[PDB]
Design a protein around this ligand. Structure first.
Ligand SMILES: [Cu+2]
Ligand SMILES: [Cu+2]
Length: 272
């Protein structure tokens, strides 16, 4: 049993999930009262993207040991990846009852609430996560996103700044700080933060798009036009870019070009 099991673990650790499953089953054929085998079968299925099966195997493991914090956590994670945020929350709580010192369960409970649109629950659980790990870039980042989503652009900015203080090479943190400034009506800052994002990933269409929109909003239609073109040469299928380019030409008084760019947008969305 033990040797079929460590053979399974060997295949698992080198990423061969199908072989790992073969040997974990052999282990269970000899010792089916073993919660670790059931659990690791779960993990194997989880890693293949088979979340229905991971759940079956994790629940089995939990019958044979309902005191494993890690198995409740992984069951929550399986539900979360299926899109069942309610069951996720139930199992994450269960994990937290057995180990409330775990930043990762708090964080993931935050995320489950975020995905339901319960932004202030998200915030409470992310704040808890951060009591227990003040050096988690991603958790300041997601705390920022929660404040952003409920319209607290000031708190969002405070938290995105914390995230950048821990990982300055993160294009998305820069980009989202841009968006926060954008939404406050501060287009000068939006532009500085979007340009930084673009230095770090120059093939993001949406960032060229939003950079175009920031210039558009200041009234610099020439500069807006250069950045909408940059966006279109990465995604020529986006009707919103064609449209916004139409508008920039319209605002300049170039009604010929507006006509052309609006006709393109409408070939790509005739119902809009
Ligand atoms: Cu099954
Ligand atoms: Cu609460």
């Amino acid at each position: 049993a033990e040797a079929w099991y460590n053979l399974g673990n060997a295949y698992y650790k080198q990423g061969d999930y199908d072989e790992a499953i073969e040997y974990y089953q052999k282990a269970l054929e000899l010792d089916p009262r073993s919660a670790e085998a059931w659990y690791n079968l779960g993990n194997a299925y989880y890693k293949q993207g088979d979340y229905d099966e991971a759940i079956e195997y994790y629940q089995k493991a939990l019958e044979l040991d309902p005191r494993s914090a890690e198995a409740w956590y992984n069951l929550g994670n399986a539900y979360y990846k299926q899109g069942d945020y309610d069951e996720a929350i139930e199992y994450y709580q269960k994990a937290l009852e057995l180990d409330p010192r775990s930043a990762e369960a708090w964080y993931n409970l935050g995320n489950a609430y975020y995905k339901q649109g319960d932004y202030d629950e998200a915030i409470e659980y992310y704040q808890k996560a951060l009591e227990l790990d003040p050096r988690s870039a991603e958790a300041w980042y997601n705390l920022g996103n929660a404040y952003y989503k409920q319209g607290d652009y000031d708190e969002a900015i405070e938290y995105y700044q914390k995230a950048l203080e821990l990982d300055p090479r993160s294009a998305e943190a820069w980009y989202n700080l841009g968006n926060a400034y954008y939404k406050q009506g501060d287009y000068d800052e939006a532009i500085e933060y979007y340009q930084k994002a673009l230095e770090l990933d120059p093939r993001s269409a949406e960032a060229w798009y939003n950079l175009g929109n920031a210039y558009y909003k200041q009234g610099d239609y020439d500069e807006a036009i250069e950045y909408y073109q940059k966006a279109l040469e990465l995604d020529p299928r986006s009707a919103e870019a064609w449209y916004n380019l139409g508008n920039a030409y319209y605002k300049q008084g170039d009604y010929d070009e507006a006509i052309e760019y609006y006709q393109k947008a409408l070939e790509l969305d005739p119902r809009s």
